[PDB]
Amino acid sequence: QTKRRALEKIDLKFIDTTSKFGHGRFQTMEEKKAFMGPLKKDRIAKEEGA
Amino acid sequence: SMLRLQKRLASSVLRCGKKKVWLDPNETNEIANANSRQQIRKLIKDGLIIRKPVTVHSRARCR
Amino acid sequence: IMNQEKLAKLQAQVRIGGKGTARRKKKVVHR
Amino acid sequence: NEVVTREYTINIHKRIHGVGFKKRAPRALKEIRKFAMKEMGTPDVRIDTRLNKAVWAKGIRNVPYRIRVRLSRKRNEDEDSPNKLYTLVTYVPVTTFKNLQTVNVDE
Amino acid sequence: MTHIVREVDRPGSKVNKKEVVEAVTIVETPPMVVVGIVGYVETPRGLRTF
Amino acid sequence: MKVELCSFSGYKIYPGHGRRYARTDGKVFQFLNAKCESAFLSKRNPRQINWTVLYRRKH
RNA sequence: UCUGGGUCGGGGUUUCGUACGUAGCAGAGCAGCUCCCUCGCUGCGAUCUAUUGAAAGUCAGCCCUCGACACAAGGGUUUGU
RNA sequence: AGAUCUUGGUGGUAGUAGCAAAUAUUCAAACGAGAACUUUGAAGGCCGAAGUGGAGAAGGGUUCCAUGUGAACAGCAGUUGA
Numbered sequence: 080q081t082k083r084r085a086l087e088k089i090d091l092k093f094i095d096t097t098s099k100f101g102h103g104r105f106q107t108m109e110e111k112k113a114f115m116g117p118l119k120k121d122r123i124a125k126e127e128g129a
Numbered sequence: 130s131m132l133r134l135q136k137r138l139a140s141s142v143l144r145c146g147k148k149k150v151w152l153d154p155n156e157t158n159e160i161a162n163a164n165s166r167q168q169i170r171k172l173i174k175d176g177l178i179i180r181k182p183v184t185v186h187s188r189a190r191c192r
Numbered sequence: 193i194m195n196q197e198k199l200a201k202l203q204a205q206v207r208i209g210g211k212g213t214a215r216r217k218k219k220v221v222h223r
Numbered sequence: 224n225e226v227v228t229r230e231y232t233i234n235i236h237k238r239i240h241g242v243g244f245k246k247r248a249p250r251a252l253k254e255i256r257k258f259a260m261k262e263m264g265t266p267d268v269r270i271d272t273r274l275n276k277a278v279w280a281k282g283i284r285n286v287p288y289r290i291r292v293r294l295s296r297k298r299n300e301d302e303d304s305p306n307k308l309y310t311l312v313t314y315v316p317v318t319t320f321k322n323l324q325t326v327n328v329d330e
Numbered sequence: 331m332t333h334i335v336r337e338v339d340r341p342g343s344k345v346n347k348k349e350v351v352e353a354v355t356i357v358e359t360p361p362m363v364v365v366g367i368v369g370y371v372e373t374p375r376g377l378r379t380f
Numbered sequence: 381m382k383v384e385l386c387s388f389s390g391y392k393i394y395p396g397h398g399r400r401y402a403r404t405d406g407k408v409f410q411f412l413n414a415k416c417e418s419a420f421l422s423k424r425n426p427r428q429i430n431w432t433v434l435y436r437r438k439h
Numbered sequence: 440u441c442u443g444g445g446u447c448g449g450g451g452u453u454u455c456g457u458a459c460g461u462a463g464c465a466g467a468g469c470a471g472c473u474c475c476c477u478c479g480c481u482g483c484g485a486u487c488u489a490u491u492g493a494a495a496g497u498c499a500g501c502c503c504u505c506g507a508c509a510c511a512a513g514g515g516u517u518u519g520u
Numbered sequence: 521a522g523a524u525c526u527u528g529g530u531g532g533u534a535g536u537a538g539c540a541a542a543u544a545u546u547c548a549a550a551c552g553a554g555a556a557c558u559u560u561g562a563a564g565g566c567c568g569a570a571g572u573g574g575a576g577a578a579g580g581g582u583u584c585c586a587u588g589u590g591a592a593c594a595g596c597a598g599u600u601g602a
């Protein structure tokens with residue numbers, strides 16, 4: 080390997096982790112929970128379990 | 130056995146189509162011995178052969 | 193006279209179809 | 224034991240995925256018949272006529288996604304046949320399919 | 331597969347000192363376990379397992 | 381890690397996602413997907429679509 | 440097997456876009472009750488609002504379960520320097 | 521031994537082409553040695569009154585109707601049948 084394309088240092092700034100099972104639009108579970116806020120499934124979970 | 134004759138005779142006696150003839154699925158042997166229109170008349174009165182009601186075509190939606 | 197079990201088996205013979213089908217008015221055997 | 228009865232829910236939608244329109248309801252009854260041969264082991268499977276009405280309730284192509292059945296492994300000791308047990312599958316009407324487990328049912 | 335974001339270190343290019351996205355393939359590589367050794371000998375008919 | 385833009389729906393758009401539309405009048409928009417883009421191009425109001433950020437903060 | 444893999448269930452993701460029912464001094468208005476009421480009450484009424492980013496689907500070739508249930512050391516045909 | 525010979529028979533092709541025009545079947549039971557096809561019942565469909573309905577002319581000539589058989593025929597089967 081001698082071309083400049085070879086031996087060129089790779090410095091990642093960002094890695095995509097959105098859902099590939101469709102048109103995902105959130106990177107993490109926590110980011111999705113933060114943006115949307117509480118849902119019905121989260122309300123009734125603590126409605127019974129306090 | 131086969132009740133092709135009995136359904137046709139009951140269709141004529143009841144003055145309906147073969148659509149509307151109900152032969153008893155349980156008393157098949159009783160009906161299979163009915164070879165004449167008189168026996169069909171007796172089986173109709175006995176309740177083994179029944180005229181089914183007209184399929185509903187309501188005009189309530191149109192009204 | 194009709195008891196609870198006689199009425200229960202009566203329900204089988206009088207229903208000769210699904211919902212919307214007519215009920216079986218009688219079933220009499222005579223010779 | 225061997226005369227047990229149990230109560231399952233069959234994901235019809237999963238088993239009829241990809242089937243064409245004029246075959247979804249007939250394939251549903253083949254899939255229910257094939258299901259009953261698995262969990263009960265009997266080659267002789269009888270489908271209750273009310274269960275046949277449930278599958279065809281919405282026509283030939285819009286078969287329901289889920290169906291709640293009841294598999295009963297009864298004795299074939301009424302005649303001479305290569306099978307000594309048959310499975311009679313009936314139809315259990317339910318208003319919901321959430322949190323429904325495969326439950327053993329008393330006779 | 332996914333995609334990343336990285337700065338480019340390619341002088342003389344339109345994308346020098348710019349952020350680009352690039353498709354990448356993730357290949358899961360658990361450690362391999364060595365369970366044997368083969369020796370070969372060079373013959374006038376090729377390499378053969380010694 | 382670049383600039384994060386916002387859609388017809390007001391959702392956050394990450395690099396490598398969605399499209400950018402440059403109208404002749406000079407205004408430029410970006411969309412998360414083809415659902416948001418088609419809604420914009422059909423001139424449907426984002427404040428009348430329930431899953432839109434603009435709807436949820438109006439109501 | 441330190442069990443196994445199924446079938447349901449659950450969670451995750453995701454698709455569409457806010458379900459039935461109930462409630463509303465919301466609603467173009469209209470028809471009936473006026474000792475009645477001093478501005479009201481009885482029906483019809485598309486639609487709107489809250490419940491409700493809800494409802495519904497989601498592997499069948501999506502991801503993780505270790506929750507439930509049964510089942511799995513079985514069958515048949517062959518093969519020797 | 522010939523005549524694209526006459527008549528009769530038989531191969532390869534070959535268990536091959538094919539049995540693909542008009543949406544569609546399913547469950548249970550009975551008869552039966554035997555049921556995808558018969559019959560009954562339940563369901564889902566089609567013709568949709570310019571019909572896949574009910575009756576005639578011409579033509580056919582017994583195909584009509586009962587009972588029975590399951591050889592051959594109905595290009596799969598058949599307990600059914602013109």
Ligand SMILES: [Mg+2]
Binds near residue numbers: 101
């Ligand atoms: Mg994808």
Ligand SMILES: [Mg+2]
């Ligand atoms: Mg699930």
Ligand SMILES: [Mg+2]
């Ligand atoms: Mg010769």
Ligand SMILES: [Mg+2]
Binds near residue numbers: 522
């Ligand atoms: Mg010669």
Ligand SMILES: [Mg+2]
């Ligand atoms: Mg062939």
Ligand SMILES: [Mg+2]
Binds near residue numbers: 539540
């Ligand atoms: Mg063919």
Ligand SMILES: [Mg+2]
Binds near residue numbers: 568
């Ligand atoms: Mg029609």
Ligand SMILES: [Mg+2]
């Ligand atoms: Mg005619």
Ligand SMILES: [Mg+2]
């Ligand atoms: Mg005849």
Ligand SMILES: [Mg+2]
């Ligand atoms: Mg034939």
